[PDB]
Amino acid sequence: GPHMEQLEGIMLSPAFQEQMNALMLDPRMLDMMIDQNPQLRNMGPEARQMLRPMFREMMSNPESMRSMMNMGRAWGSKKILIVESDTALSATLRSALEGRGFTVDETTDGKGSVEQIRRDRPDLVVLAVDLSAGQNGYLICGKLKKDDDLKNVPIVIIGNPDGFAQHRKLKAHADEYVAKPVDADQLVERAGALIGFPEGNSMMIALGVACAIALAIAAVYF
Amino acid sequence: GPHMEQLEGIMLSPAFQEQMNALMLDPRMLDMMIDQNPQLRNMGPEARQMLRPMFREMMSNPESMRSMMNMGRAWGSKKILIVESDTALSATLRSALEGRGFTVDETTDGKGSVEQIRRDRPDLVVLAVDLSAGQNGYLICGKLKKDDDLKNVPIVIIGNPDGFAQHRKLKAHADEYVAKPVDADQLVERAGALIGFPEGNSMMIALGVACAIALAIAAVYF
């Protein structure tokens, strides 16, 4: 899933260690951030005094940070469904999205796509205009945007741009439009704009769990 | 500095809240992550029982996460010095780097750039081959890579690629070479590969502070 190697690199880089050293050298900074949180502001002076020792221990072995980054990577996986009858293009787009950290499913079957989306509930749909067996990405897109359960699912249409402007003005329109021939990396960036990029989503979950842990300990012990 | 707007978007997104809901629904997963950390494994059942309540409180108002992300943004700035005599090019590259979140300084004075780097200790140097007053980026790069204090400062040379191959084989070589005319955006990503991207660095600091806080509280109370 998410590609955290560079982020793991940062955690071990000299610069990260020096920057955290600097940030915690004057405790006014951290005391202020701590005191912004009503639930943490009663943290006593003994605990604040252990902030620098605990960071030093943390950097000699940052299992705490690595533990939570791993949790986030595991739950920060977002899923993209590609509805595209051009198998070769669908496979190329899947590997690029997978190469960015996304989980990707694929289907040739325009007619079954709407109910498949309902069943599997992907985080984003890449939907080609020109599909097999007389199905059409514009038609499929109109069905999804008319459905109250599925209308908030982001759809990126890929296809001949001839019809984009007119389809965009419809009340049931796609969330984005990407012209064919599609350059996979551009598509990757558009998916990351609509939903998260996997590494940022993983760090957000890692931080959320770390905060929840600190708040739960505080709640019981202050 | 760092541009957190997408990251702040994620934290307020419905998907992030649902993913966090799912993650804490079965506490086996969270218990395992907690128990990986010797300093946290003795967290009592009362505190573990407050994990979902505190998370719910977190999502009603995520001041904890916001205050840590803001701390990280404030200390996640990394500084790039551009040594380039072409003022128009230096300005364009600076604004592209600043647009991605880096702090950027500029100079046309190659003669004094070595000592300026020593004084200011930037995290990365963009160094043009062709400079004014008979200075040369290859020569400057050789001075820096022979200096024990500054030889670990990453240098991205920009210029005529004619001399890249030969300079690369020298013992005092640059860390990266980018041909002129420079595509600013790819220069940006080369800087992000050598040092962090600012948003990832900021999230790393935010997670580090969160973990240090949780570990210090735990150290004092269990």
Side-chain angles (χ1 to χ4, degrees), chain A residues 6-7 19 23 29 33 36-37 39 47 57-58 63-64 67 71 75 192 201 204 206-208 211 216-217, chain B residues 6 10 19 29 33 36-37 39 57-58 63-64 67-68 71 75 77 192-193 201 203-204 207-208 217:
Chain A
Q6 183 162 40
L7 279 169
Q19 284 185 326
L23 157 58
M29 189 51 95
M33 196 203 74
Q36 267 169 223
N37 295 281
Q39 305 103 324
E57 168 141 306
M58 214 174 72
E63 171 83 58
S64 58
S67 269
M71 197 52 68
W75 295 84
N201 200 51
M204 203 56 53
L207 183 70
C211 288
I217 297 173
Chain B
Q6 165 142 77
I10 294 187
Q19 288 181 334
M29 174 67 80
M33 201 215 63
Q36 283 177 31
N37 296 287
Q39 307 100 321
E57 189 162 319
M58 233 174 67
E63 172 78 33
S64 63
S67 78
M68 285 169 205
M71 189 55 45
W75 299 80
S77 324
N201 199 46
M203 288 301 293
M204 202 54 69
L207 183 71
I217 294 170

Side-chain angles (χ1 to χ4, degrees), chain B residues 1 8 15 28 31-32 38 40 65 68-69 98 141 155 163 167 170 174 181 184 187 194 196 198 200-201 215 221:
Chain B
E8 297 186 41
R28 203 190 251 111
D31 280 331
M32 188 181 330
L40 294 184
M65 306 178 63
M68 285 169 205
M69 290 165 59
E98 272 170 355
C141 180
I155 294 159
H167 197 262
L170 298 169
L187 179 64
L194 287 170
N201 199 46
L215 285 170
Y221 292 102

Side-chain angles (χ1 to χ4, degrees), chain B residues 177-192:
Chain B
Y177 300 82
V178 171
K180 265 182 201 188
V182 184
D183 184 341
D185 290 341
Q186 280 154 4
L187 179 64
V188 160
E189 310 270 350
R190 298 315 319 146

